[PDB]
């Protein structure tokens, strides 16, 4: 079997790090996957020795030492995802799975903006949502306490034309903005629109 | 490589019959499929070159009948289906060449009963004129609320064409009410645009929610609406 490290992972926009496998058994190839969110294994690499690059991913195997390595450098959100190794034994087409290393990447926000805005309805002008936005990845968004209320966690988009990235989460109810999201630490500087 | 598997999530009751499809790319003789849990622990099901079995997870254990004829998809099928058996069902496959390729998988969820599956109701939410004044940007938020199981796929839509720049969706549905293991999913989804953009009301925006409800052959004896797998949408024309 295989044993895979780390286990999960939080990486700056930018930076780098490198995932590892140890063979607790001889194996005579391995593949690396990234497991996206919508569950596709992608496919990055195959290897039975040395060494081979992929863009800004690297990866080593070397059977006798018994162990495959995936470097990742400067780190970009496409990168997020679950990384996967998988080897074929020595002496069994199967493939053995490590445990998997769940890939964060942390946006690095340029010029953070927080705020709460109120949204209307298409339909309906009465229904609304309110949309907590533009603060910088130090933030953490809490659930709600109270069962009436449904608040999401952060969601980073990327507006690639503008290169511009945000962050933001959403709260809804059958209340205010300006204490949708109290149970959250949010900036001092919070802009709250006076509507 | 280009590995074809169908559907692409499977709501079945307890006891029901549970049939998925793999086709895999033509010059590929081997197919495998694997079972990923939650825990993202896999475990081989079956191997098949040409028609033939090659290797096989311990018969004992053996929960499926599975074949592959010639020109015909690889189907892989649960008889008595049970609560154990969801899961993400994966088939990949190779040509000597030792290399495996996925397939997209299918999401199989096994429930007591079909009896609290809901489509999903969809509504977009226009952007706040403060954000647009103060940012010069223009956020808008689709909400897809009473769906179960959580099976959707949510996408955007800009004058017709798809669009993944400037989305963000929920990884995670929530459940409206947590104390139900049996409760209804809400998500969410952010598309940004530039004011400018939002302000041209020749713009079209449409939020897409495609569900995976039951089939024709699921027996539907209730009073209201059958559940059926469909599209949900909503939408918004740009706004001076």
């Known amino acids: 079997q295989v044993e895979q490290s780390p286990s999960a992972l939080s990486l700056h926009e930018g930076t780098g790090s490198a995932l590892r496998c140890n063979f607790t058994?001889?194996?005579?190839?391995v593949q690396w996957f990234q497991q996206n969110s919508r569950g596709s294994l992608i496919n990055l690499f195959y290897?039975?020795?040395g060494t081979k690059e992929n863009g800004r991913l690297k990866s080593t195997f070397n059977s006798k030492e018994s162990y495959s390595t995936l470097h990742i450098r400067d780190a970009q959100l496409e990168d997020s995802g679950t990384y996967f190794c998988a080897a074929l034994r020595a002496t069994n087409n199967k493939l053995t799975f490590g445990q998997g290393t769940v890939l964060s990447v942390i946006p690095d926000i340029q010029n953070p903006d927080p705020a709460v805005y109120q949204l209307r309805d298409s339909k309906s002008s009465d229904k609304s949502v309110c949309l907590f936005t533009d603060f910088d990845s130090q933030t953490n968004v809490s659930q709600s306490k109270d069962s009436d209320v449904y608040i999401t966690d952060k969601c980073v988009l990327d507006m690639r034309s503008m290169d511009f990235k945000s962050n933001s989460a959403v709260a809804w109810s059958n209340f205010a903005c300006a204490n949708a999201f109290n149970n959250s630490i949010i900036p001092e500087d919070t802009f709250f629109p006076s509507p | 490589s280009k590995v074809i598997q169908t559907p692409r999530y499977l709501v079945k009751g307890q006891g029901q019959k549970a049939k998925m499809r793999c086709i895999p790319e033509?010059?590929?003789?081997?197919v495998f499929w694997y079972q990923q849990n939650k825990n993202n622990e896999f475990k081989f099901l079956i191997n098949?070159?040409?028609?033939?079995?090659?290797?096989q997870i311990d018969m004992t254990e053996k929960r499926f009948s599975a074949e592959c004829p010639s020109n015909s998809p690889c189907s892989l099928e649960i008889q008595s289906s049970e609560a154990g058996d969801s899961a993400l069902y994966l088939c990949?496959?190779?040509?000597?060449?030792?290399?495996?390729?996925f397939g997209p998988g299918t999401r199989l969820l096994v429930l007591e009963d079909l009896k609290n599956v809901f489509p999903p109701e969809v509504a977009v939410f226009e952007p706040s004129e403060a954000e647009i004044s103060h940012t010069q940007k223009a956020t808008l938020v689709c909400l897809a609320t009473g769906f179960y199981p959580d099976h959707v796929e949510l996408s955007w839509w800009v004058n017709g064409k798809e669009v993944h720049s400037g989305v963000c969706t929920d990884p995670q549905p929530l459940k409206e009410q947590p104390a139900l293991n049996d409760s209804r999913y809400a998500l969410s989804s952010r598309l940004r645009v530039s004011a400018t953009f939002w302000q041209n009301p020749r713009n079209h925006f449409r939020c897409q929610v495609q569900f995976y409800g039951l089939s024709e052959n699921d027996e539907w004896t209730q009073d209201r609406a059958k559940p059926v797998t469909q599209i949900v949408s909503a939408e918004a024309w740009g706004r001076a």
């Open positions: 990949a496959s190779s040509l000597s060449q030792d290399t495996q390729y």
């Open positions: 058994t001889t194996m005579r190839a």
């Open positions: 033509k010059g590929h003789p081997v």
């Open positions: 290897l039975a020795s």
């Open positions: 098949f070159q040409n028609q033939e079995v090659l290797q």
